Amino acid sequence: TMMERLHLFPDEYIPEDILKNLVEELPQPRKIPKRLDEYTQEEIDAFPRLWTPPEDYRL
């Protein structure tokens, strides 16, 4: 019965009734570690440069 009370869905789509019954969207446990493209460039300016590479290096 407890598993009958549980409704899971594969994507963002939820039917209209179950969207109408909702209360209190729960916070997430994990933190979604925020990949480098989204770092709001002032934060990249805030973090210091740690090392001076030699000028004759090709990478």
Binding site: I14, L19, K20, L22, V23, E24, E25
Partner: protein, 148 residues
């Protein structure tokens, strides 16, 4: 065993302690044998202690029937209508006095399982718990994933 016996909830009979307290016992029917070794303790009780017990609490009525019987009995009827009959066959004076005092003390409700021994009648004061207690409201009552 508790599953094999009935049960009641803890309650007073007619709200005794709020207003005035009343003695919940009405009658005490003593049947004592004239001759007989089975009722010697009840014989000495009727001689010496029943008059002082009757003067002790005037609410109860005491009858001494003085009948030829092999097993002397005391019949106690309470205010709400219950009847509890116990035997005083071959007991001392002290045990009979303790028995009739314990009969005079208790109320007529049945001696069964007492089942959660407290009877608060307004159990909540600040407001009983519902699932929207300790849950904050949001602006214009919008549910999650709502558009307007």
């Amino acid at each position: 065993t508790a599953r094999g016996t009935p049960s009641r909830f803890l309650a007073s009979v007619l709200h005794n302690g709020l207003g005035r307290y009343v003695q919940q016992l009405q009658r005490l029917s003593f049947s004592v044998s004239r001759d007989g070794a089975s009722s010697r303790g009840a014989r000495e009780f009727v001689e010496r202690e029943v008059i002082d017990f009757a003067r002790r609490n005037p609410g109860v009525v005491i009858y001494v029937n003085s009948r030829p019987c092999c097993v002397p009995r005391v019949v106690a009827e309470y205010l709400n209508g219950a009847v509890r009959e116990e035997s005083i066959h071959c007991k001392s004076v002290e045990e009979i006095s303790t028995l009739v005092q314990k009969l005079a003390d208790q109320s007529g409700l049945d001696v069964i399982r007492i089942r959660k021994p407290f009877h608060t009648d307004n159990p909540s004061i600040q407001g009983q718990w519902h699932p929207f207690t300790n849950k904050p409201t949001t602006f214009r009552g919008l549910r999650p994933r709502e558009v307007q």
